[PDB]
Each structure stands twice: as structure tokens, then as C-alpha cells.
Design an enzyme around this catalytic site. Structure first.
Site, PDB file in Angstrom:
ATOM      1  CB  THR A 122     -12.392 -11.876  24.245  1.00  0.00           C
ATOM      2  OG1 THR A 122     -12.981 -12.287  25.496  1.00  0.00           O
ATOM      3  CG2 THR A 122     -10.942 -11.777  24.401  1.00  0.00           C
ATOM      4  CB  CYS A 123     -16.995  -9.730  26.643  1.00  0.00           C
ATOM      5  SG  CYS A 123     -16.160 -10.496  27.933  1.00  0.00           S
ATOM      6  CB  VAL A 124     -17.964  -6.316  22.901  1.00  0.00           C
ATOM      7  CG1 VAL A 124     -18.862  -6.787  24.259  1.00  0.00           C
ATOM      8  CG2 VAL A 124     -16.871  -5.658  23.620  1.00  0.00           C
TER       9      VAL A 124
END
Lengths: 1235, 74, 75
Positions: free
Chosen positions: A1201-1203
Site C-alpha cells: 500500500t505504500c507504493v
């Protein structure tokens, strides 16, 4: 060191196995080394031994490590490349004749790593031909390294040394049409550097370019999607420009090879004028090329002043002119379109020069049939009245050429659009400036004396109409219809409106209130709204409702005013350094203030002053140094203010940079001279008793002022038009407050007031890194953004808010996020980490916001028993707290009780507040217990602090608030009427409206004097509403729906009658909108201002804050928008099967599955404004890696979910994909177990 | 779902829980988030080699309980 | 010996189990009855993560007990 000697002794040996062991050990030691760890490593002794070992023939394995040792030595210690560069002959010899491919590949890698600093040695070593002689035999990486070596060698070349590339040019030229990106990039760099180095040698340029390079690069530039990037596009176009300028023969050759088609395709698009959006640098380079392809101007005649402001093409034009005619006809339109739609000192000047040369070298007929569907006279007239003494000269020269070539056509246009007037103005009203002034004066005088010396039903008619709008003389309504006819159906120009005083007269007509006026303001406004728009005449209001339809004349007047404002404006745009700012630092001197002397006297002298440092750093340094005491100590450093800084009579705020402190209160002097800063230690309640409510404010009366507002300081020739447009927009927004009965609708939607030039200038000014980093945004931009925000769209105002409302780090972060194209800018921000638990989220959220809610550092939230951290959990924190703030148990908002869909284990059965128009606060009477009020107030304070912190950190919330809420937020609560009850309570509004239908009848019937008291009483008692009278309704003075809120004292035994009903309605509206919802909003305002002031929200309207706080509006996706921002890679190259199934399956949801998918992937159930295209990391799709035993079918997808990294199996059907993408999104939520 | 150990010169053990199809650049970004080292001074070393950006962990055959090294550059 | 396994939202699955049964057998049965692979199942009992390599008797798990199932997918 100690092991290094042993390894060196091992290298200097005889046994082959000893050598092999020694080289493996040396490579291993070098890989994990570092500059600090590997200090003192012997490079004067190890290198020659390694070279001697490499110079062998009997083994094909020792060399693969001998090369690796040198490669790693260069990688680790970036200073061994003074002894390392001695086996260039050995590497080249190994490249010359090939025995092992891997040895050649390693030699190529070593040479590539060495060439970054030593390319001349390779160039004189003859490596350029050696590397490329066997170019077709290696793999991809070796080819890329060889081309990089070629580029780095050709970077520094000399005219004397040309035989090293003379025989290798054809190989690169044939290589220029490959399908590999990096090889093409390197070859193009090589060609650009060669052309730049050989620019003064025409013969060498002809040798380099020949006739195939032009062709190959010409079809390279056109292929879509672009193989090249933006910077390399710029470089290649600049190569064309330089080549054409330095040698006209290739300019002729390109002009004979339909380069016009390529330029047209690049600028506008397709071969079937909507210009493709491009960066300013690309447009500048293309315009420069177009200018260079054209013949140069003569150096005599009226062009002699260009020497102070600072062939073959002509032969071809004298030859067959069909080619030149086609070129001019093809490019003039795009040139003019680029000129009229770009705001920049370079693009405009280049386009102007190109236009001058095109006009000069064309004949009568070509200019006649090119300058047909264009407006050139207005542009010349606008650019004559400018401060810069370049555009004025250009305009004069254009006017002279056009008058000489086409006298008949361009003799009425100049008079009608005010060119002769401006030339007469210039001709009547430390040496170069005087000389060019004299030239301008003489040229204008000659033009006036020659062309316009001895000399109309529109200007006179407009003057006659505008002389009837005088305040001292009655005008009836004929002046307005005359003006409407002239504006709607005529050919009036922007100069005629200026010459015949119209804007000022209309402004005074609409916005004057005195005692000498012959007509009152109200009648004038109603006459205006009757002529423009279709409202009734004064004194003739119909019994029904004023709901006019036509609005065309007002729109026409608005458009004409916008065009005039665009024509007349002369605002400046300052764009242009970074290396200087990042290198040099400021100097300051500290002197004690004479009035008070308690602290120690400064004697150090110069003070360490970073350009972007804050004064808090200076205060901390003074406290630590011991000057604050009335050795270095950290107890004082580890808020309360003890010291203060002053400069002159101006106080220095703590949140201010030293650069701005020097620049404003106290340029070359800023960075040269030394500055000095002084330091020094630091009621009858009428509403409840009588029953009277405050009057409703009319927002239009503050806008109707003739003088400029106090916020405006700039001086421009278009101020009057700005004020008139402000007045007209105020009338458009607020016109129902002047009529007793009217429908709340805007005459013209606010999207039709957008000016197309101020927006371009603002957007251009909001792209220069230096101004954002220093804070030199011009005053006019902020002043117009705060006073007249209807000129700009939403994105411009949002960017301006983010740039001017916070610190420089957030501004630079926003600029980098919005413009990924870009002495390098590098923001530096602090981060605070906090841990929470998913069982008491509200309490811990309140504690977090109480401690670090108002801090100036980013906040990241982690959880207790989970290993995930970053930008996913932080967004999920807001997404969950916002949902928690809607519980029915708290008792805060209006609405109904519902149950959420797809809850957690404990979230089931929890009631949530749902309302289909938004959320508004509940009313509290005068009998509420203090505990309940205090609880509600603290909850509202926490909510306000939460939103204020979320805005500052670029996060998004999930709270659907209502329009009256934002009206309260923007301090507009004093202008709320019965129209707004439809946004809070649909059923009460209908009753209020039907009851207001009776007071009008009662007043009208009482206004008739031809009756008696008994007749009046019977008529009033007879009035009925839907078969029941006001007495039959049987209401009281309790707010409807809530039978515990008293409008006034004793409101239980006081029934509503026909005699007192207006008071009842006014009390109902006031208690529902302002009174009972006051204490609950004061706490919200106090909480919000604890982070940053509400006064920075003046760039937005109440209907635009939803997009700023929450996400964009819901919309149904389709494959078209999905296959333009989603980037599939790593096993799923575009037009695959899994990507196709996925793009088909997303574009079928019902916004609930959309919310689930967005929460599963991104972490928040919302998207930024713009949709998928606005996500900075595009959704990347990759193939999940499995084994040969387990089927890649009964698995589940994964996401980082960070990227936005989506790992997706290759399913064998679409039903399986549907059934296994929902399980992940539903049963795999609220967990970060893999990070 | 696999776990790997990243070990520095001073002596630590960062237990990263990742998947085989992850990019090396993402791993360096996570190490930045967890330790603070900028994602440009890092030079990851596996089996006496130097890992390169733009690849995946499955390319180098990285498996369960495989120890990497983190050597910084100045 | 029919312990209950509860998913996140609302689902409860009965599962027959022997006393000396490892976590792997329980995960395989859950995969057979629900479809979740035995690689992305993380069983939690009381407040502890059930490690693999032991039996339910070690954790004092008995008849009519309730376990929680959480999937290992996000990051």
C-alpha cells in the site's frame, strides 16, 4: 592492511591455485569495504600486480576475477582511479580479439566505470572503434555500456582529432533506429555532443549529418508513444537549431524534406488548433527551430536599433517559392496560437521575431490570405503600451511593414483598435536607454506624420448612450436597452469602451448612494435586472415567484468585459540561481540593544546564518551559548519564550526565515553587506425575554462600493474592469435578497467568469522553484486570489493555498509531487511516530491530537502487534477515526440510524448516523445540563483539531459534512435564510414555506384601506391553509420535531395565532440555524485555530471545501481511463490477459466495491482530485511468482500500500478472479502483517 | 511470505518480512523508513555481489532466512 | 472436539479435530472447507499467535473453543 599485505604476497607468487585463492579473497574483501573501513589499502602495489596477472593467455577463469577486483576497487574507493588507469591498453587488447565473451563484458563494465572521469585517455587510446567493432555479438548490457563509453569519449573531442569517429559514424547512424530505449538515448547524446563540439566547422557538420542522420532522427521524433524522454527531446531539438543556424545548407536540405509536417505534428497533433500541452522549454526549442529555418533580417533600415537592444535560404526563396509558401501557410497559424497562449519572456520574444521575419519575407497575397481569420491589430495595440523597450520596437516595426505592404486592408483596423492613438501618445508625450528612447520617438513621429495625418456610428452612439447614465440626470430605461443592443449585436472594440467612459459610469450607476442622485439605488438595480436578465420592473412584482429564464445579455457583457480586461492588463510575471542559493550562506552581526543591557555583550563577530534557517535556531544558539543566563548545556535546550529579536521598529515573528527578515525589514546588499539584529530578554437578554431576533444581513451591500477595497494595493490600467466584474459577480450570486419572493439560483454559474490569461500567468508563476523556495510571490497574485477568486480555477487556488499558507518544506514537497519533471531541490522534514491500539481508538486519538496535534512535523501512526509502518497505516488512522466520529451513541448530528455494510467482529450492531444531504449539529436549549454541553464541546474541539491537522499533512478524511457547516466555517452564519432549511430538515422547510405563503396574503389584505375593523378581523380569521386555519393547527413556541426547546420564556401556554406568526417563523429559523448551534461551533473554531488560522481559507467557496477535505466525487470507471495511468510490468506487459480481465472487472462496481478496493490497495476509501491520473505512484501491476506444483489459481492477490504495488496471479477464468478478488478486499482488511 | 535479515556494519538485525516478487528499491525505501538512511547511500550485498535497482528478489533466488548486508557510501 | 473458527466479518466454521493434532492439519482442514491456502492463514487463540510445530493440547484448547482467523495479505 594486515590482511592486505598477505593478499599482495599471495598475488606475487607462482602457484596457479594460490593466485586463484588470493584473487577471490581480494574481491571478497573489496566488495564489503568502504572509504572509512578500507583506509590505507595499498593501491600503488596491488594494482600493478593485478595488471600483470591480467596480462595472461592460459586461463579463462582468473581474468573474470582480475577484472572484478579493479571494478570493485574503483567502486569502493573513488580515488584509486589514478593508479587504476594503466591497463587501458590491456582492456583494449582483450577487446580487439575475442576468446571469452564474459571477459569482454567485464572489460566493458570496467571501462564504462572508468570513463566517468578519464575519457581523454580512452580517446587517444583508440577505444571508440575497438568497442564498436564487435558491437553485434555481445548482450544487451554490454551494448549499453559500449554506447555509454562512446558517448563519454565523444563528449570531449577536438577538431584535430576526428579519425577516431570518422569511420564509426555510419555504425551509430544505422544504430539510431533501434527499438531499445537506452541505446537510442546514448547514441543521441553522442550526436548532440559531437554537433555542439563541431559547431564552428561547417565541413565537419556536413560530414557528421550527411543525409541519413536527418532522416533517421526525423522519424525518431514522430513515433508515438515517444521513445525519448522530455530532456532528450529538448536536446535533440536544440541540436537541430544549432545545426541549422551554423550552416544554412542543411537548413535548406531540411526545408526541402518536409520538416514542416513534423513541426506541425509535434506542435498541434495529427494530420487531419488544439495544441498538445508541452513544457515551456519544449515550446521554446521548437519556436527557436522555426525561427532558425527562416531567413535572417537585414541589418540596415529600421532594424539598426537591434544592434543596441542586444546565405542559402534567401537564394532558395528567390528560386521555386512553392516550398516557402507551403512552409509559411503551414506554420503561421501554429506560431500565432503559441504566441497568444503562452506567458513567458522567452517564448513570446522568439515567436515575435519569427513573426517579423515571416511578414518581412512574404509578399502581398500570402500575407493577405494568411492574416484573414486572426486579430493582429489588437495584439499590436496591447504590446505597444508596455514598459519593456523591446516589445515596443518590435510592434513599431510590424506596424511599419504591414502599412507598407497592405495599405488598404490595414487602414481602418488600426484606427478602430487604437494603434494610431497609442503611436500619437508615444510621439507627443546611461546612453543606450536614451538612444533607444530617441529612436522610438523619431519612428513614432515619422509614422504619424506619414500614414495618419489628415482625417463612426458606433463610438458616437456609445457616447450618447453613456451620457444618459449620469446620476444627476434621469435616464429612464432607454439607455440600458441601447447598451444591450450595442453589446449583443455590433462590432464594438475594446478601445472604444475605454475611450467612451462606460465601465466607470456603470460602476457609479450601480454602486452609488448619495443625496444629490436623481434616482434611488434600488430602482436602478431593478431596472438593470429587468433589462439584463428578466426580473420584474419596480413596483410591479407579480403575486407568484420571480423565476426568470433568460440570462444571455449578462453573459455577453461579462465576456466583453473579460476580453477588455485581458487586452488592457500589464501584470508582470517573474520567472528565472539554485546553485548560488544552495552554496552561499548569509552573514549577520549581533549587537546588544542600548535601551536594555542585562545579558552578556556579543563579541564573536560574524554569526553562522543559513539562508533558510529560522529565528528559532538563533534563539536556541543564544540560549545554549550562555548569553541567556541573567560551556555547552542541554538542560536549557531540552514553548516558553525567554529571548526576543528585534530589527528597527518591526517585531520578528518566530516562524520567519532569516532571508526574508533581511530582505523585508532591512538584492546584492543582502548577500554582501553585514546586517545587525538586536536581542533582548522577554446585559439584558432581549431574545429570551421580549422575543426579538437579530436582523438578517445582506451580503451584497458590502460589495457595492465604488472605491477599491482596502486589500488592493497594486496600480494597473485595468483596475476599473476588475471592480466592475466584482460587482457583477456579487449581483449574480446575491440577487434574491433584494426581492421578497425569489428562487435561490445564480444567474451565471461561477465557472463562466474564468479569465484565460490570468490563469496562465498564475500557473506559470507557480512553477519556478526559486520563488517557491524563497517566497517572492508577487503581491498582485495573492491580492487577487483573496479579493477576486472567480478569475482562477480550483487547482490554481489550491496550489496557491498550499504554497503561501505553510512553511517552505511543504511547498517544495507539493511542487515535487505535482511536477515530477524536476543545484537540486531537496526538502527536509521531521517525522514523529506514535503507536495506537485498535480497541480504544477514540481515546488514544484524542491523546495523540492533544500532544502532537499542533506540531510542525509529519505524523506517522503505527500499531502495537503489527509490523507495518509508513503511509498506509497513517491514512487508515484518519479513515477509521472519521468513521468512529459518526456513532449514534455520541449524539452529535442529525439524521437516521443505520448499520454499516461488511463490519468487523465487534463493529456489528453499532448504529451510525446517516443523512442524505449531509451532517449538521443538533440544537441544545437553555435547560441542558453542563456535563452534556461540555462533552459535546470537547468532541467538537477534537474534530476541529483533527481536520486542521489532516489538511496540513496532505491527508484526506471521510466525513460527509453539509453546506451550512462550511458557511459557518467561513464566518457567514449571519446571512442564513429559509432557503437553507432544505439542507438540514426537508419536512420542516415545507411547513415554513406554506406558512410564509400566509403572511404575504395577510399583509396584502391589511394594506387595503377600503375596509373596516370587523371586515379586517373576519378576513384575517378566514384565512386557511389546506383546509385548516392557523388556530386549527394548534402549535406552540417549541421548536418543531424537538418538543423540549423553547423559542422564548413561557412557550408552552402561548399558542401561535395569525397576529403573531412572523415572530414565530423568525424564531424557528434563528433557533434552528444560529442559536442552538453556537456553543458547539465556537469550540470547533477554537480547536481549528490551534493549528493554523481559518483566514487562509478565503480562496475557496462553501461548495469547494468538500474536495479540499475529502476526496473527489464518485464516478464510474472504464477501460479508457484505466489504460492510461495504470503501469503493468514484471510479467504483465500491456495487452496481456490478466490486465485485460482486471480492467474489465473494475469498471463494473457500484461504488461500494469501489470503496472496498480503494481501501484494500491504497489504504483510504477516496482518491485525490483528478482520479487515477493524480496518484503520484501509479498503480503498478506485477505477476506473482509461484512454483511448479501449486496451481496459480487457488491463491489470493497481494498489495504493498505504500507504493500501490499489486501482485496478481495469472488466473484461468474471470469468475475465479471475481470470487478471489472480493475475499481479499472483504476478509483481508484492517491488518498490516507483511511489511 | 518470507522473512530475511538485513545486517549492518555496527551490528544489527532488521527482520524484513517481504515477498519474492518485491523490488529492491522498495526494500531500500522500507529500510529508510525503519532506520532513516536515505535511499541513495545504501549498497546491498548478497553472496559477494552488489544488488542492482530495477530487479526483483526472485531473480537472485533470495529465499527464507537469507542474510543480506548493508554497506553505506559517502 | 468440534472447535469453532471465526473469520473477520461474521462467519463461524465448525471443525472436527483430534487431541494430538498439529496446526498444519487444522490449516489444511480450513483450506478444504473454506478455500484459503494454508500459507496465508494466521490463527490466534485468546491473545496469542499460534505457532506451527505443536499441538492444540499444548495451548489448552478444548471442545467448544473459539479461534480467530486473520489473513496475511496486506502490507
Amino acid at each position: 592492511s594486515s590482511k592486505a599485505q598477505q593478499l599482495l604476497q599471495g598475488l606475487q607468487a607462482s602457484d596457479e591455485s594460490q593466485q586463484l585463492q588470493a584473487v577471490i579473497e581480494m574481491c571478497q574483501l573489496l566488495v564489503m569495504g568502504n572509504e572509512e573501513t578500507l583506509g590505507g589499502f595499498p593501491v600503488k602495489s596491488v594494482v600493478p600486480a593485478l595488471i600483470t596477472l591480467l596480462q595472461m593467455e592460459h586461463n579463462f577463469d582468473i581474468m573474470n576475477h582480475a577484472c572484478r577486483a579493479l571494478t570493485y576497487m574503483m567502486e569502493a574507493l573513488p580515488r584509486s582511479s589514478a593508479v587504476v588507469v594503466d591497463a587501458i591498453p590491456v582492456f583494449l587488447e582483450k577487446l580487439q580479439v575475442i576468446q571469452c565473451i564474459d571477459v569482454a563484458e567485464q572489460a566493458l563494465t570496467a571501462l564504462e566505470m572508468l570513463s566517468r572521469r578519464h575519457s581523454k585517455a580512452i580517446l587517444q587510446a583508440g577505444g571508440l572503434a575497438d568497442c564498436l567493432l564487435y558491437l553485434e555479438f555481445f548482450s544487451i548490457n554490454a551494448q549499453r555500456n559500449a554506447l555509454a563509453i562512446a558517448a563519454n569519449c565523444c563528449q570531449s573531442i577536438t577538431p584535430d582529432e576526428f579519425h577516431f569517429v570518422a569511420d564509426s559514424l555510419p555504425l551509430l547512424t544505422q544504430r539510431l533506429t533501434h527499438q531499445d530505449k537506452k541505446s537510442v538515448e546514448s547514441t543521441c547524446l553522442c550526436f548532440a555532443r559531437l554537433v555542439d563540439n563541431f559547431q564552428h566547422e561547417e565541413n565537419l557538420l556536413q560530414q557528421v549529418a550527411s543525409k541519413d542522420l536527418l532522416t533517421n532522427v526525423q522519424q525518431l521524433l514522430v513515433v508515438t508513444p515517444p521513445i525519448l524522454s522530455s530532456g532528450m527531446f529538448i536536446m535533440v531539438v536544440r541540436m537541430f537549431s544549432l545545426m541549422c543556424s551554423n550552416c544554412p545548407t542543411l537548413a535548406v536540405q531540411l526545408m526541402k524534406q518536409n520538416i514542416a509536417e513534423t513541426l506541425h505534428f509535434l506542435l498541434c497533433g495529427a494530420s487531419n488548433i488544439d495544441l498538445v500541452p508541452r513544457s515551456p522549454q519544449e515550446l521554446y526549442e521548437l519556436t527557436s527551430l522555426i525561427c532558425e529555418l527562416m531567413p535572417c533580417l537585414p541589418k540596415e533600415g529600421i532594424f539598426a536599433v537591434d544592434t543596441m537592444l542586444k546565405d542559402a535560404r534567401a537564394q532558395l526563396m528567390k528560386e521555386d517559392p512553392e516550398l516557402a509558401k507551403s512552409f509559411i501557410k503551414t506554420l503561421f497559424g501554429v506560431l500565432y496560437e503559441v504566441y497568444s497562449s503562452s506567458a513567458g519572456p522567452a517564448v513570446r520574444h522568439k515567436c515575435l521575431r519569427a513573426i517579423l521575419r515571416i511578414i518581412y519575407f512574404a509578399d502581398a497575397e500570402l500575407l493577405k490570405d494568411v492574416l484573414k481569420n486572426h486579430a493582429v491589430s489588437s495584439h499590436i495595440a496591447s504590446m505597444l503600451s508596455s514598459q519593456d523597450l523591446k516589445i515596443v520596437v518590435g510592434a513599431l516595426q510590424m506596424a511599419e511593414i504591414l502599412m507598407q505592404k497592405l495599405p488598404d486592408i490595414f487602414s481602418v483596423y488600426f484606427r478602430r483598435e487604437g494603434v494610431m492613438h497609442q503611436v500619437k501618445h508615444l510621439a507627443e508625450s546611461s546612453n543606450n536607454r536614451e538612444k533607444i528612447k530617441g529612436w522610438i520617438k523619431e519612428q513614432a513621429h515619422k509614422f504619424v506624420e506619414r500614414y495618419f495625418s489628415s482625417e463612426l456610428n458606433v463610438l458616437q452612439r456609445l457616447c450618447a448612450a453613456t451620457e444618459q447614465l449620469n446620476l444627476q440626470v434621469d435616464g429612464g430605461a432607454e439607455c440600458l436597452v441601447e447598451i444591450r443592443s450595442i453589446v449583443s449585436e455590433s462590432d464594438v472594440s475594446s478601445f472604444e469602451i475605454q475611450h467612451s467612459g462606460f465601465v466607470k459610469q456603470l460602476l457609479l450607476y450601480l454602486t452609488s448612494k448619495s443625496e444629490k442622485d436623481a434616482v434611488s439605488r434600488e430602482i436602478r438595480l431593478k431596472r438593470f435586472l429587468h433589462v439584463f436578465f428578466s426580473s420584474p420592473l419596480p413596483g410591479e412584482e407579480p403575486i407568484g415567484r420571480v423565476e426568470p429564464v433568460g440570462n444571455a445579455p449578462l453573459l455577453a457583457l461579462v465576456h466583453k468585459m473579460n476580453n477588455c480586461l485581458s487586452q488592457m492588463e500589464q501584470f508582470p510575471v517573474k520567472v528565472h540561481a539554485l546553485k548560488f542559493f544552495n552554496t552561499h550562506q548569509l552573514k549577520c552581526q549581533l549587537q546588544r540593544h542600548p535601551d536594555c543591557a542585562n545579558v552578556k555583550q556579543w563579541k564573536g563577530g560574524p554569526v553562522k546564518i543559513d539562508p533558510l534557517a529560522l529565528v528559532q535556531a538563533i534563539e536556541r544558539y543564544l540560549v545554549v551559548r550562555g548569553y541567556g543566563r541573567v560551556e555547552i548545556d542541554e538542560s536549557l535546550a531540552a514553548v516558553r519564550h525567554r529571548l526576543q529579536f528585534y530589527i528597527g521598529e518591526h517585531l520578528l515573528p518566530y516562524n520567519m526565515t532569516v532571508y526574508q527578515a533581511v530582505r523585508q525589514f532591512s538584492r546584492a546588499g543582502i548577500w554582501t553587506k553585514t546586517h545587525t539584529i538586536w536581542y533582548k530578554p522577554v446585559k439584558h437578554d432581549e431574545l429570551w425575554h421580549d422575543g426579538v431576533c437579530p436582523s438578517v444581513s445582506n451580503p451584497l451591500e458590502v460589495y457595492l462600493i465604488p472605491t477599491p477595497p482596502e486589500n488592493i494595493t497594486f496600480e494597473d490600467p485595468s483596475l476599473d474592469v476588475i471592480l466592475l466584474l466584482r460587482v457583477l459577480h456579487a449581483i449574480s450570486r446575491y440577487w434574491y435578497y433584494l426581492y421578497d419572493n425569489a428562487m435561490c439560483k445564480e444567474i451565471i454559474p461561477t465557472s463562466e467568469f474564468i479569465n484565460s490569461k490570468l490563469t496562465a500567468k498564475a500557473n506559470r508563476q507557480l512553477q519556478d522553484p526559486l520563488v517557491i523556495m524563497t517566497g517572492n510571490i508577487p503581491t498582485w497574485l495573492t491580492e487577487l486570489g483573496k479579493t477576486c477568486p472567480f478569475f482562477f480555477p480550483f487547482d490554481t487556488r489550491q496550489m496557491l493555498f498550499y504554497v503561501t499558507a505553510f512553511d517552505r518544506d511543504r511547498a517544495m514537497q507539493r511542487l515535487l509531487d505535482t511536477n515530477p519533471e524536476i543545484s537540486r531541490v531537496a526538502p527536509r522534514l521531521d517525522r514523529k511516530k506514535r503507536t495506537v491500539n485498535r480497541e480504544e481508538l477514540l481515546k488514544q486519538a484524542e491523546s495523540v491530537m492533544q500532544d502532537l496535534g499542533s506540531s510542525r512535523a509529519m505524523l506517522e501512526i503505527q500499531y502495537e502487534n503489527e509490523v507495518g509502518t509508513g503511509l498506509g497505516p497513517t491514512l487508515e488512522f484518519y479513515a477509521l477515526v472519521s468513521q468512529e466520529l459518526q456513532r449514534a451513541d455520541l449524539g452529535l448530528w442529525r439524521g437516521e440510524e443505520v448499520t454499516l455494510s461488511n463490519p468487523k467482529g465487534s463493529q456489528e450492531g453499532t448504529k451510525y448516523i446517516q443523512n442524505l444531504q449531509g451532517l449538521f449539529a443538533l440544537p441544545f436549549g437553555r435547560t441542558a445540563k453542563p456535563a452534556h454541553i461540555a462533552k459535546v464541546k470537547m468532541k467538537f474541539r477534537f474534530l476541529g483539531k483533527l481536520m486542521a491537522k489532516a489538511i496540513m499533512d496532505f491527508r484526506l478524511v471521510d466525513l460527509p459534512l453539509g453546506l451550512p457547516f462550511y458557511k459557518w466555517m467561513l464566518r457567514q452564519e449571519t446571512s442564513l435564510t429559509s432557503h437553507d432549511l432544505f439542507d438540514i430538515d426537508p419536512v420542516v422547510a415545507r411547513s415554513v414555506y406554506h406558512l410564509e405563503d400566509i403572511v404575504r396574503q395577510k399583509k396584502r389584505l391589511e394594506q387595503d384601506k377600503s375596509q373596516t375593523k370587523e371586515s379586517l378581523q373576519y378576513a384575517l380569521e378566514t384565512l386557511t391553509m389546506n383546509g385548516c386555519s392557523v388556530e386549527d393547527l394548534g402549535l406552540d413556541f417549541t421548536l418543531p420535531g424537538f418538543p423540549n426547546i423553547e423559542l422564548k420564556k413561557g412557550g408552552k401556554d402561548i399558542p401561535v395565532t395569525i397576529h403573531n406568526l412572523e415572530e414565530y417563523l423568525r424564531l424557528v429559523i434563528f433557533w434552528a440555524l444560529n442559536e442552538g448551534v453556537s456553543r458547539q461551533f465556537d469550540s470547533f473554531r477554537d480547536g481549528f485555530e490551534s493549528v493554523f488560522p481559518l483566514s487562509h481559507l478565503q480562496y475557496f467557496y462553501p461548495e469547494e471545501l468538500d474536495q479540499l477535505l475529502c476526496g473527489s466525487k464518485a464516478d464510474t470507471w472504464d477501460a479508457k481511463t484505466l489504460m492510461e495511468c495504470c503501469r503493468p510490468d514484471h510479467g504483465y506487459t500491456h495487452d496481456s490477459r490478466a490486465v485485460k480481465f482486471l480492467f474489465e472487472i473494475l469498471s463494473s462496481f457500484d461504488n461500494e466495491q469501489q470503496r472496498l478496493f480503494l481501501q484494500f490497495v491504497t489504504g483510504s476509501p477516496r482518491l485525490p482530485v483528478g482520479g487515477f491520473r493524480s496518484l503520484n505512484p501509479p498503480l503498478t501491476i506485477v505477476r506473482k511468482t509461484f512454483e511448479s506444483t501449486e496451481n496459480p489459481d487457488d491463491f489470493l492477490p497481494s498489495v504493498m500500500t505504500c507504493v500501490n504495488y499489486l501482485k496478481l496471479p495469472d488466473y484461468s477464468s474471470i469468475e475465479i478472479m471475481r470470487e478471489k478478488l472480493l475475499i481479499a478486499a472483504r476478509e483481508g482488511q484492517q491488518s498490516f502483517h507483511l511489511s | 511470505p518470507m522473512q530475511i535479515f538485513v545486517k549492518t556494519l555496527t551490528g544489527k538485525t532488521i527482520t524484513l518480512e517481504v515477498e519474492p516478487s518485491d523490488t529492491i528499491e522498495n526494500v531500500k525505501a522500507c529500510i529508510q523508513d525503519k532506520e532513516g538512511i536515505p535511499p541513495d547511500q545504501q549498497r546491498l550485498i548478497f553472496a559477494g555481489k552488489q544488488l542492482e535497482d530495477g530487479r526483483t528478489l526472485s531473480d537472485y533466488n533470495i529465499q527464507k532466512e537469507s542474510t543480506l548486508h548493508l554497506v553505506l557510501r559517502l
